[PDB]
A paper describes a structure:
SEN has been proposed to contribute to the virulence of GAS by serving as a plasmin(ogen) receptor. Although SEN has the ability to bind plasmin(ogen), it also catalyzes the conversion of 2-phosphoglycerate to phosphoenolpyruvate as part of the glycolytic pathway inside the cell. Alpha-enolases are typically homodimeric, however they have been found in some bacterial species including GAS to be octameric, consisting of a tetramer of dimers. Each subunit is made up of an N-terminal domain (residues 1–143) and a C-terminal domain (residues 144–435).
The crystal structures for SENK312A and SENK362A were determined at 2.15 Å and 2.10 Å resolution, respectively, and were consistent with the wild-type protein in terms of octameric structure and packing of secondary structural elements. There were, however, differences in the subunit interface area when compared to the wild-type protein, with the total buried surface area for SENK312A and SENK362A corresponding to 24,230 Å2 and 23,070 Å2, respectively (the corresponding value for wild-type SEN is 24,912 Å2). K362 forms several interactions in the minor interface that may function to stabilize the octamer. Each K362 is within hydrogen-bonding distance of up to four other entities: carbonyl oxygens of T389 and N390 in a nearby loop on the same protomer, and side chains of E359’ and E363’ from the opposing protomer. Although no significant difference is observed in the SENK362A structure in the vicinity of the substitution, this mutation is expected to make the octamer less stable, because both the inter- and intra-protomer interactions are affected. The melting point of SENK362A however, was reduced to 51.1°C, indicating that it was less stable than the wild-type protein. Size-exclusion chromatography in preparation for mass spectrometry showed that while wild-type SEN and SENK312A eluted as a single peak, SENK362A eluted as two peaks. This is consistent with the mass spectrum of SENK362A acquired under conditions where non-covalent interactions are preserved, which demonstrates that there is a mixture of monomer, heptamer and octamer present in the first peak to elute, indicative of a solution state equilibrium between these species. Surprisingly, two SEN mutants bound more plasminogen than the wild-type protein, with the percent increase in plasminogen binding for SENK312A and SENK362A corresponding to 196% and 341%, respectively. The higher activation rate of plasminogen when mixed with SENK362A is likely to be due to an increase in the amount of plasminogen present in the tPA-susceptible conformation induced upon binding to SEN.
Numbering used by the authors: 1 to 433
Amino acid sequence: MSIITDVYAREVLDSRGNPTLEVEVYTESGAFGRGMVPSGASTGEHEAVELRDGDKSRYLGLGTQKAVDNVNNIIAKAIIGYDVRDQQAIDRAMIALDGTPNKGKLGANAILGVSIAVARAAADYLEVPLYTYLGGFNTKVLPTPMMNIINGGSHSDAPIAFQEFMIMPVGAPTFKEGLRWGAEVFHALKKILKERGLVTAVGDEGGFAPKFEGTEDGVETILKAIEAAGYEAGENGIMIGFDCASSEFYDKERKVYDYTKFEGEGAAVRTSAEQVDYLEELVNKYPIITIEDGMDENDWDGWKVLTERLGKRVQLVGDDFFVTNTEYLARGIKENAANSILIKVNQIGTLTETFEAIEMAAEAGYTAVVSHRSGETEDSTIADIAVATNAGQIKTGSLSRTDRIAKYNQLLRIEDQLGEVAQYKGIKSFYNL
């Protein structure tokens, strides 16, 4: 009755028009779950591998017919017959079935698709909301969102090194209001960009990549839009964060942060020690609450110095530093590097391992920030994961494009359902600080 009778994958498209897959799970009783998988770029060899077809005549080699076949031909027969509620047993079964460390045989996308589909089918079976199924009875914290409002780095032609600039409505009373604050600042910013004759078309995540003069111009324009929408810049209103993605401009063989990469030949070329100083400059100069990948993915002492210097004032998120991998998170914790981790579900491949990463972080006093990918789908599972774990934060995009807005809407539904029980922690989300 609760027993899984069908597991079926198919090829669909992500928010960038590139193939991905979805899986559907049915129980004998007819309970249904669908899991869609986002795109996963790979950073190193120590991460779940998304399986692509490689046939360059078709979708530029980005097809997923192989992963789909793996679900239908290998995984389905293995998993069919399990109770839909045995999430852990099922995920482990799939890890063993693949038998390789990076889930490269069956594909991390095939495995995750099934993991999510089973969880959602289980919730449907039990007739409870997904966050309840994942987290148990004590789910209640709506996440303070960090919203990608301006893009730099490779996602831009402006002389800015940092990949993302985000706003966080840490001063809002509820998620619903916080979401409105973000939306309003976003519309004010669009208005400001039009006035300056800058481009208001959006990137993968719904933000702008305007031809600013440099990093200071960008930040100051965000501050402009924050004031224009009528909110405070600070802990009582809206604060700012970075995804530096500094690995993208780290010279491995010179061991220095080379800004000329993205900011032209006048740009600074900084040693780790100087990288930490520049970040500190910005933190003193601006209402910065969070900084992601401020150091290089393998610059472990650089991370240690940064954490020593700002770790008590600022959230420091390891994204490529940790790649949702508890082996790396464990070392960060031991070595006092970072105080936050970016959780990308498909960077690891199962919900079970995902939640293990979230718990390891939390128990070390680190925050876990559930994250979108560049290629998204109409799925909003990470909304439920964020609430399920009372994580307190989420990173799921700017305030346009349904590939982002779907998560925000789902969060609205969850808040609405929790009623008086819902909590929004704002600045108190940062228990790592």
